């Protein structure tokens, strides 16, 4: 069965993804919960908008929750008459239908990879989470005589698998590291800003790689017309038109994606603010820092291990920069809020009839939230300052650092350039919210004029590895730093 | 006064226990609080069952708590007519009376050890928590001419004290490490299971060591009839009858012990679930792992130091095994629960009349508990994987590891064999609850057929150390690994 | 402009303080918030005492908070008739007026230091938090030809700046380390007690350094009459009279300072007890431990770095001393409180009409506080004991240790002598509350008889550094230990 594949790229990608997902049942269950998350968000928002009445809920015999819920018939009648809501529900239904169809198609293709694991590799589905990827790669390459997946090429090699899995991630790394994509901007009051989100990356990959109109013919060969310099201008113009149309589509879909992002951000993070608002101050490796610190021919887990080992030194380093004004404001606000809250709590404990006064419960809640938020900006008063060994420890893991960082380890310029690789979580969320608004502006006005230069890149930096196909040229662009893959 | 003892075993055990309890007043106070804990549990459960009425409490002018409490006379009348409760109270009273009498007898014997510390050793009761056991041992052995506790033997030795204190723990170690006790079982759906609890250990020590019918004549000499192989079968049969009778007694007492265990588990752990349910996921060294990693002639603190030093590497190692399905379920349940709880909290903050709706407070409480529980199964997303150095660091402390562990440090078999030495806290509680049910079945059906082999052990592995008595043979059974006492 | 200063001591102190405060705007904002803190405390306490009525608040249609607030006119009438409150308000107003006038005067003098930073040093106010003090010192000393601040002395030196900033802190260090100040006391039931607070230090510096009647003539020269031994007795008598008058003034002001301290302690710490009572068990370097471990000619940040680096080993060391009785009491109290609270929480969750019973909410709150407090005295059950390497690591940072500490690292005497350098936070607060009561007794009865010896000190241990002035003799008093500045 594993002879007529013709899509070894997708086959190896699935073989890797099924091992990274810890088997088949876990993958199926994750996909099911993703679908259920979307359905639950949509249904819960619609129910909140239509069914509940909020009149007999806000009290304007004890009243139950089911009284505030309208019966099914009148709620359906109120739903089917909104007009501006059924037109959103239709689109959110067709999108979910497309997603469910894609999931149904993916299950029938992942069952075959499950069978390929069970029989061809002799690896049970209960030994996957205990087999490193090197062992699975060795079992793939050494048994390539039985399943005979690739006979055209004389043999199979680990480098062949690395090229098959990472044919487009190498192109993305080379495009980001040669400053061929518009992800640096100058803003008044902020300065340099790196705006790279998931929407922008998805749009770049849709414009350049996927679709029947992209630069790559089938899966592993860019169209031969893109290997001839005699028509640079015409190809650049066609790519510009494609980018313009995709940007127009994004601008049209902007409000739906914005509503979805707002709803998801609320349903996902509006409780962490209440309970533990310090979790949104912890930093994470930005999406640009994942493409800047990535080697060529490096799988996702190989990069994630390095980004994990260098996470605590990076947090320590970014904590070595005291923000004085923020700490002053936090200290004083915490003092005032706690001084009012102590009086409120004492009056509540003495005689509890105070809990019946109107705005006492809300005041206690909001003052507790204020104290908890303010006490999260105050660093540990006894912390050491070693901002020079920390960069050495970090560079020993991430392997990449601009050359003007080793000496001046404590300046204000090094921090403002490391913060683009190691960004806040709140900034991540905030620029995830603004992505559906800014992405069309970036695609229409900023990426479109570069459509010529890109055409040159794919023409000058695409090699032909025998048996694999058209791959990206390796680290000849010595704009980055030390390697050690 | 310290010449006519005749029970040097118990004397040295008390001298060690008074130092391990940080003096005399702390020991007295701990015993008093244990008695008060038992009395409080029983009295509080009886009061909850009988006095309170729960009719005018559940509301079916503001009502006070003392209204729900029945007056003393009617509560006593309701207690003395239950029949199925006074028969439990009588037994719980005679058991507590026996415990209190034992405590009263132990105080009059520990005051003498206090005097022995003050005068014979010249160690004030305020310098005990600052004197290591080596110093107390040296002061015992070097001043053995004044108090002349042991004149029969020519001198006193540290090894003599070690043998006197640990005469039965060595026997327990040798019995557990030679697989002479039934504590490994095969279960459908679980596989290998090590069931070793405090009830089983207490029953083993009662069957073999304590009592006027055990194998040991007075304190330090097993009956001479157990040193002759001419009557192996008769002694095995007598031991089998003894085990059967003790198992029958345990089976009869099963319901009382089960009720006590349920009540104690509720009163002790039902609040940690509410506030911090992650404390019951932290692991601890099981009761079998304390007898498997124990050297011969090793006091309790000498073993506890090693089990403390190797606690954080063991936690790190057991955390290096990601449970994928549990993490998926936890993530999704936390998302859903928090998404509902955020809406509830926002509606509560906006207008607080919502707090009067019937099932809003209970819903908020249960959803908070659900979020807090689910957020305790999600590991740190940035954690390193070094499961090979961790076993080296652990073995450098616990000194014992099966030989097929060093190489294959990340397999599923090594984890399932280390988890029997380092078990969950929730599993500890759960198998503490099932102990009064399973212990009689283990004693009647599993330990009884081995009654012959044990008789051989005590006959072939009991040496006679001069001046000390009948002790267990040392580590000639090379079934374990590296030592270094 | 920077030629006619004549007060280089204050100028260099301000230049250092503006850099330690992270610029000018942060300093201004901190001073403003200090003034606002005082004003807020006074106004809030007066409002609580007078305006609110607590009759219609304790409930003896839903009642609002503004109903309990009396209208402005009747509240002003109730304020202006208290008599025993307006006499406190007048004093708290004149003190705040003096503070505000001092702040207004300090701003007009710190703007000049801001200009001196901007122009003379060419350091923008946005590069201060990224310039170590060594760089600012180098820019001060190397550009001393342009601003020509000090021409009398041939040149300027880093040692000159060190002497100018720390002319009185060296005197305080030498006075504390020669046992010339009464800060050790013998108390029945406690033993040795080191009572050194901020009030005592302020009074010492006011008696000896500041004021027109102190020992120092203008700023940098003690009166020549204090360099002649022909009048030791008369000068000692005059100093004794001065100390007596200052102590009488403190005894008169005692009630106001005591009221202020009580109010500030409540408004600042009465919420940390509720939420996280374990933060008041964490230790901090006492005010005596900051003067005992301080080198000569050592700025505040140079000492704070050492006190920061040696904070975690010191906490570990002070945690290695188990308090047995406290742990027993904490365990048992936590058990009882949690056992009652679990029943209350279960009854609350089952049927919520129980929340309307009178003393259920207060009971739940107080039992939660009790459980949270008791669970803060229980140490980690798996902790290592290495109390000998910890003293080495600590001494490698604090540089000072009595000689009888290295060997006997675990005795009860070493802990009771380290706890005076590393005290609790609760003890700090408690002896901050008792300071206005004990300070006059210490100044009148204990410091006054020493008034002769001090007069000898300033006469025998004051050298004349050329260009700087009268400074304190360096570490010739070899009563302390290893240095390495
Ligand atoms: C686009 C599709 C929209 C779907 C909308 C639903 C999405 C839901 C998803 C999620 C909402 C989660 C809460 C659901 C409410 C459950 C409450 C409950 O127990 O049952 C409720 C019981 O209701 P009842 O008592 O029969 O009604 C009382 C009416 N009465 C006052 C006249 C008697
Ligand atoms: C013109 C042609 C093409 C123009 C279409 C441009 C769409 C741009 C979407 C940008 C975007 O946010 O994509 C993001 C998600 O988005 C998706 O996964 C698909 C979004 C499709 C939105 C269409 C709504 C229904 C249209 C109905 C019209 C009637 C990309 O995020 P990601 O993580 O890269 O994607 C992984 C998907 N996952 C997160 C669900 C696993
Ligand atoms: C409500 C706030 C919810 C979001 C909380 C996190 C926002 C955030 O990124 O905070 C960050 C910045 O924060 C800033 O730079 C400005 C602070 C938040 C702006 C809003 C002010 C309050 C409204 C946190 O600032 P930080 O000093 O890095 O705090 C971490 C320092 N620590 C890890 C030592 C504790
Ligand atoms: O920027 C500054 C701080 O700026 C902040 O830290 C802003 C933080 C406040 C935003 C909080 C949003 C909370 C969204 C959730 C609320 C719940 C959802 C509510 C939904 C309704 C600098 O931050 P940085 O990380 O140094 O800069 C990195 C950015 N860069 C890479 C572009 C340089
Ligand atoms: C086996 C032995 C059984 C012992 C059972 C006791 C175990 C207790 C151990 C523990 C229970 C802990 C709670 C005890 C209740 C105390 C409440 C309180 O303050 O006093 C209570 C006051 O009661 P009262 O107001 O006099 O009664 C009101 C009756 N009336 C409504 C008619 C007026
Ligand atoms: C036939 C002859 C003997 C048969 C008796 C067999 C009893 C088996 C008990 C098993 C058990 O759980 O023991 C456990 C406790 O238990 C005890 O401490 C004593 C329990 C006695 C229960 C009798 C109830 C009253 C009987 C009235 C009849 C009328 C052992 O636990 P442990 O920690 O080893 O013990 C330390 C005790 N401590 C925890 C209190 C410090
Ligand atoms: O087993 C698996 C997990 O299994 C679990 O972890 C089960 C945990 C759920 C039990 C929770 C009980 C809470 C009791 C308190 C509630 C409050 C009291 C309520 C009282 C009414 C494996 O776990 P392990 O540790 O790898 O296996 C060790 C077991 N062995 C040594 C036999 C191999
Ligand atoms: C020494 C100087 C003393 C200064 C004292 C003040 C210090 C304050 C500092 C701090 C107190 C902080 C709380 C202030 C109260 C604010 C409440 C609010 O919103 O306004 C309040 C609104 O009040 P109102 O509704 O106009 O009054 C209702 C009266 N009525 C019932 C007759 C209608
Ligand atoms: C006779 C002559 C002098 C006798 C006066 C002796 C005063 C002793 C005060 C002791 C004291 O607690 O001082 C403390 C504070 O205190 C101050 O800052 C000033 C206190 C003045 C109190 C006068 C009240 C109004 C008198 C009105 C009469 C009509 C010292 O604390 P500190 O931290 O060293 O000071 C820094 C100030 N800071 C904390 C605000 C930054
Ligand atoms: C209410 C209490 C509020 C203050 C809490 C802190 C008081 C305090 O200094 O506790 C301290 C002592 O504490 C003692 O030495 C006695 C304990 C407090 C005395 C009052 C008893 C309860 C009333 C804490 O005692 P500890 O054992 O150092 O606790 C820290 C040990 N740990 C860091 C390992 C957890
Ligand atoms: O002493 C012993 C413990 O003693 C304690 O630890 C006492 C702690 C309880 C005091 C809590 C006060 C809380 C004040 C806030 C409440 C809110 C405000 C409420 C305001 C109304 C020993 O402690 P130590 O640290 O080893 O001894 C150092 C002291 N020495 C240097 C003198 C030796």
């Amino acid at each position: 069965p594993w002879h007529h594949i013709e899509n070894l790229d997708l086959f190896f990608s699935r073989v890797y993804n099924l091992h990274q997902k810890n088997g088949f049942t876990c993958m199926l269950i994750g996909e099911i919960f993703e679908l259920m998350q979307f359905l639950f968000v949509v249904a819960f928002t619609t129910f909140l908008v239509s069914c509940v009445d909020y009149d007999i809920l806000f009290a304007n015999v004890k009243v139950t929750l089911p009284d505030a819920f309208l019966p099914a018939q009148v709620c359906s009648a109120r739903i089917q008459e909104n007009g501006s809501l059924i037109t959103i529900l239709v689109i959110a239904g067709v999108f979910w239908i497309h997603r469910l169809i894609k999931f149904i198609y993916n299950i029938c293709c992942y069952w075959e990879i499950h069978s390929f694991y069970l029989h061809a590799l002799r690896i049970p589905m209960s030994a996957l989470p205990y087999c490193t990827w090197q062992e699975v790669q060795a079992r793939i390459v050494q048994t390539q005589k039985e399943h005979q997946i690739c006979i055209h090429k004389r043999e199979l090699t680990e480098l062949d698998i690395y090229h098959r899995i990472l044919r487009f991630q190498n192109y993305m790394v080379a495009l980001v590291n040669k400053s061929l994509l518009p992800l640096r901007f100058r803003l008044p009051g902020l300065g340099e800003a790196v705006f790279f989100t998931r929407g922008l990356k998805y749009n770049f990959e849709l414009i350049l790689f996927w679709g029947p109109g992209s630069l790559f013919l089938n899966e592993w060969s860019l169209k031969a017309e893109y290997k001839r310099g005699g028509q640079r201008l015409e190809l650049a113009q066609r790519l510009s038109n494609r980018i313009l149309w995709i940007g127009i589509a994004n601008f049209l879909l902007c409000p739906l994606i914005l509503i979805w992002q707002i709803l998801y951000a609320f349903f996902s993070y509006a409780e962490v603010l209440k309970r533990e608002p310090g979790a949104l101050g912890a930093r994470c490796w930005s999406l640009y820092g994942r493409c800047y610190l990535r080697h060529f021919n490096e799988l996702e887990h190989e990069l994630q291990s390095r980004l994990n080992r260098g996470y605590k030194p990076a947090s320590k380093y970014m904590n070595c920069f005291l923000s004085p004004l923020l700490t002053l404001l936090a200290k004083n606000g915490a003092f005032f809020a706690g001084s009012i809250l102590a009086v409120l709590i004492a009056l509540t404990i003495y005689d509890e009839d105070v809990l019946a006064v109107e705005h006492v419960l809300t005041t206690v809640t909001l003052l507790g939230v204020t104290v908890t938020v303010c006490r999260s900006f105050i660093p540990d008063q006894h912390m050491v300052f070693c901002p020079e060994q920390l960069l050495r420890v970090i560079l020993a893991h991430i392997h990449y650092m601009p050359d003007h960082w080793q000496g001046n380890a404590h300046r204000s310029q090094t921090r403002d350039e490391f913060a683009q690789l190691f960004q806040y979580k709140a900034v991540f969320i905030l620029e995830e919210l603004l992505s559906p608004i800014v992405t069309p502006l970036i695609l229409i006005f900023c990426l479109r004029p570069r459509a010529l230069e890109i055409i040159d890149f794919f023409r000058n930096f695409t090699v032909e590895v025998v048996g694999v196909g058209d791959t990206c040229s390796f680290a000849q662009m010595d704009v980055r730093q030390h390697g050690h893959p």
Side-chain angles (χ1 to χ4, degrees), chain A:
Chain A
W2 319 292
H3 192 189
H4 47 57
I5 298 169
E6 319 166 309
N7 211 2
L8 277 183
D9 281 314
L10 191 65
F11 175 78
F12 282 132
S13 297
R14 269 165 185 157
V15 168
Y16 177 66
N17 193 1
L18 187 87
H19 160 52
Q20 283 305 106
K21 289 302 182 294
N22 286 319
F24 176 68
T25 184
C26 315
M27 203 209 58
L28 172 61
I29 286 171
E31 295 292 327
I32 290 168
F33 279 108
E34 210 172 323
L35 300 198
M36 274 165 50
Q37 273 190 6
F38 186 88
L39 188 54
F40 163 85
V41 160
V42 174
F44 196 38
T45 305
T46 289
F47 163 85
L48 282 184
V49 161
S50 304
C51 273
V52 194
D53 55 349
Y54 306 123
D55 262 296
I56 65 171
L57 197 72
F58 293 156
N60 70 338
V61 62
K62 195 183 289 185
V63 18
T64 48
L65 271 174
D67 306 321
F69 301 160
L70 286 177
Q73 299 354 354
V74 59
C75 197
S76 88
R78 198 158 319 282
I79 281 177
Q80 285 158 101
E81 204 145 312
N82 217 306
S84 315
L85 180 79
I86 202 72
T87 181
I88 295 174
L89 286 198
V90 159
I91 306 177
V94 305
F95 174 68
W96 190 77
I97 280 295
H98 154 71
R99 197 148 283 279
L100 172 66
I101 278 179
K102 193 176 71 193
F103 158 74
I104 284 186
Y105 158 72
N106 270 344
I107 296 302
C108 290
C109 275
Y110 267 110
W111 188 246
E112 194 161 63
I113 315 291
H114 160 95
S115 303
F116 170 79
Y117 262 98
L118 263 187
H119 300 335
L121 276 70
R122 281 173 284 275
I123 296 183
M125 219 46 57
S126 80
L128 264 191
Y130 310 105
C131 274
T132 61
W133 171 249
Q134 321 300 327
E135 311 186 10
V136 186
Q137 192 168 93
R139 201 83 66 104
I140 286 184
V141 59
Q142 85 180 4
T143 78
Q144 71 103 20
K145 325 290 198 306
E146 289 85 86
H147 46 83
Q148 51 182 344
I149 56 171
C150 167
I151 301 197
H152 296 88
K153 178 63 165 320
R154 213 68 71 88
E155 191 180 2
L156 213 65
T157 317
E158 317 96 309
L159 178 84
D160 283 6
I161 305 175
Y162 269 79
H163 272 104
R164 292 280 186 180
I165 302 177
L166 301 169
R167 189 191 297 278
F168 294 139
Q169 273 301 326
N170 295 343
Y171 271 123
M172 276 306 300
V173 167
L175 279 167
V176 165
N177 296 349
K178 291 194 73 173
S179 291
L180 270 177
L181 300 177
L183 56 88
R184 317 288 283 264
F185 300 110
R186 295 288 298 166
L187 290 184
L190 211 54
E192 264 291 321
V194 180
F195 191 88
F196 198 35
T197 55
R198 287 171 185 170
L200 278 175
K201 197 196 175 198
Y202 180 76
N203 278 294
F204 293 162
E205 297 178 329
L206 162 67
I207 285 164
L208 286 152
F209 304 135
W210 316 322
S214 45
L215 273 74
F216 284 72
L217 173 57
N218 48 7
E219 181 70 358
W220 42 276
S221 312
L222 72 162
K223 306 171 176 172
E225 55 175 339
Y226 288 92
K227 292 169 189 157
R228 306 190 297 266
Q231 39 183 351
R232 295 188 329 118
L233 323 178
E234 186 260 349
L235 293 167
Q237 192 52 235
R238 190 190 307 159
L239 187 66
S240 159
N241 311 336
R242 183 159 215 265
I243 296 172
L244 171 79
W245 291 128
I246 300 280
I248 290 298
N250 289 317
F251 179 76
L252 292 186
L253 292 181
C254 174
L256 297 187
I257 310 174
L258 187 51
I259 287 176
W260 161 255
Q261 290 294 342
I262 295 279
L263 291 183
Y264 191 78
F266 178 79
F267 282 148
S268 197
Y269 296 118
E271 185 57 300
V272 181
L273 289 181
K274 180 70 182 294
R275 181 184 37 83
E276 183 215 350
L280 296 185
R283 300 171 159 278
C284 68
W285 297 100
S286 44
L287 191 41
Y288 164 69
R290 295 184 137 271
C291 274
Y292 174 81
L293 311 165
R294 179 158 185 157
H295 288 311
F296 280 99
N297 275 4
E298 192 183 27
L299 304 168
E300 187 76 28
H301 69 280
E302 299 182 19
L303 166 64
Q304 185 64 31
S305 304
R306 301 201 281 103
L307 298 196
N308 283 3
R309 287 164 139 77
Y311 178 80
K312 284 170 74 172
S315 315
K316 292 181 204 155
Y317 173 73
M318 295 311 280
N319 282 352
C320 278
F321 285 90
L322 267 293
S323 316
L325 187 52
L326 196 70
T327 312
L328 275 174
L329 296 180
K331 279 181 184 296
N332 294 122
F335 172 78
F336 293 133
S339 61
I340 301 182
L341 197 46
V343 168
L344 265 188
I345 277 176
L347 284 182
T348 312
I349 278 177
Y350 174 62
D351 182 274
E352 79 172 40
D353 303 304
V354 189
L355 280 169
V357 191
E358 294 193 356
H359 300 285
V360 166
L361 278 170
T362 302
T363 304
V364 166
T365 290
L366 292 178
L367 287 178
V369 175
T370 291
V371 171
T372 299
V373 162
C374 286
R375 286 200 190 277
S376 87
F377 300 156
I378 301 179
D380 49 346
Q381 320 300 38
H382 313 265
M383 77 164 310
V384 306
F385 269 48
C386 51
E388 191 48 83
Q389 314 144 50
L390 287 175
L391 287 180
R392 297 199 204 109
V393 185
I394 293 161
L395 159 73
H397 300 309
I398 73 179
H399 292 190
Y400 290 97
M401 268 186 192
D403 312 285
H404 56 79
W405 277 18
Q406 282 315 105
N408 44 313
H410 53 280
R411 301 308 143 80
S412 140
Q413 182 207 52
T414 298
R415 192 269 310 276
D416 298 341
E417 277 180 3
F418 195 93
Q420 294 163 355
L421 271 54
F422 207 59
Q423 76 184 2
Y424 278 128
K425 183 89 176 175
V427 169
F428 165 83
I429 304 153
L430 173 57
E431 84 184 24
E432 272 300 355
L433 259 61
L434 309 185
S435 163
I437 297 174
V438 182
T439 301
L441 305 191
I442 290 184
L443 287 167
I444 295 288
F445 301 105
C446 296
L447 176 60
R448 207 153 63 95
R450 283 167 170 274
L452 177 54
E453 315 179 0
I454 288 186
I455 291 298
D456 287 342
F457 166 77
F458 277 91
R459 201 185 83 249
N460 292 339
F461 289 84
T462 285
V463 311
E464 284 205 51
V465 188
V466 295
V468 174
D470 293 78
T471 80
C472 174
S473 307
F474 287 163
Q476 337 298 324
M477 50 217 79
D478 211 351
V479 305
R480 276 190 312 181
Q481 275 67 33
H482 295 89
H484 180 202

